[PDB]
Design a protein around this ligand. Structure first.
Ligand code: ZN
Length: 285
């Protein structure tokens, strides 16, 4: 009748897959889409040495989708699916976890600009691949969860109506110290576990409610799947979401690995049945 209030996050590797594939899965009884949020993986954080500015760097694949958002993103949004832009390190001195307070304020502004320009629903922070320097260059600090917390906090302040989501990994795995006297629960909307993670996040992000905790993420390319027991645990403990990374009906493992997992999610999380459309969406770029 109605879809359970457990959000399914689907991370689409834009270098490989068309995000419209997220439309191909429906819940038989409720008639609703299986996927609640699509994360475009991923844009990058980069440093412009000339203007000493940190900026959102989009590779040709991300750019393609943003540029053509009426084609690739609007159809998701029209169905009520939220579209989130991931931000990842990109081999230079800048990253998610080493901005000074001033730089964090400036980057949060950049994020806000990007989200406004392309009508994005929020961001996902993943602190990986930056080439952090020692000692820290000018306007950068030693990488730390506290510096990451500052960025997440400034991002929320810049766009209070949009989603701020973080990875339970590296320096965004915990924000135990208030920022300007505000707790994590006040600026983080969702914290997403690394593959198979299932522990409670309340102490990692003080103030974060169970509804903001995304558990036992699956990796559909590598074939790292959740058990039925792990999914039932989400329902019985009252957690708010689940995540799947790199779903792609065009990959050779779809029938043998992906589909059975998607059917298990429909059953265990939503107590319903999966309907797969069988609509081709290829990387047409
Ligand atoms: Zn690279």
């Amino acid at each position: 009748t109605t879809k359970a209030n457990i959000k399914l996050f689907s991370f689409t590797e834009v270098n490989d897959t068309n995000p419209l594939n997220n439309l191909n899965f429906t819940l038989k009884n409720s008639g609703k889409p299986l996927v609640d949020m699509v994360v475009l993986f991923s844009a990058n954080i980069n440093y412009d040495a000339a203007n000493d500015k940190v900026f959102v760097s989009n590779n040709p694949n991300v750019q393609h989708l943003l540029t053509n958002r009426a084609k690739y993103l609007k159809p998701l949004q029209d169905k009520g699916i939220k579209v989130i832009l991931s931000i990842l390190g990109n081999h230079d001195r800048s990253g998610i976890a080493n901005l000074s307070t001033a730089r964090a304020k400036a980057f949060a502004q950049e994020l806000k600009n990007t989200c406004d320009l392309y009508n994005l629903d929020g961001v996902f922070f993943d602190d990986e691949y930056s080439a952090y320097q020692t000692p820290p260059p000018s306007g950068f600090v030693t990488p730390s969860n506290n510096a990451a917390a500052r960025l997440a906090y400034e991002t929320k302040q810049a766009m209070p109506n949009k989603l701020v989501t973080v990875y339970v990994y590296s320096r965004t795995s915990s924000f135990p110290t208030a920022v300007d006297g505000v707790n994590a629960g006040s600026y983080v909307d969702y914290a997403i576990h690394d593959y198979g993670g299932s522990y409670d996040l309340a102490t990692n992000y003080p103030g974060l409610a169970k509804s903001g905790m995304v558990m036992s993420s699956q990796e559909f390319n590598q074939g790292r799947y959740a058990t039925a027991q792990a999914l039932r645990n989400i329902v019985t403990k009252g957690y708010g979401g689940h995540m799947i990374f790199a779903m792609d009906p065009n990959r050779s493992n779809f029938t043998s690995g992906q589909l059975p997992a998607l059917k298990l999610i429909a059953k265990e999380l939503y107590g319903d049945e999966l309907v797969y459309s069988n609509t081709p969406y290829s990387k047409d770029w």
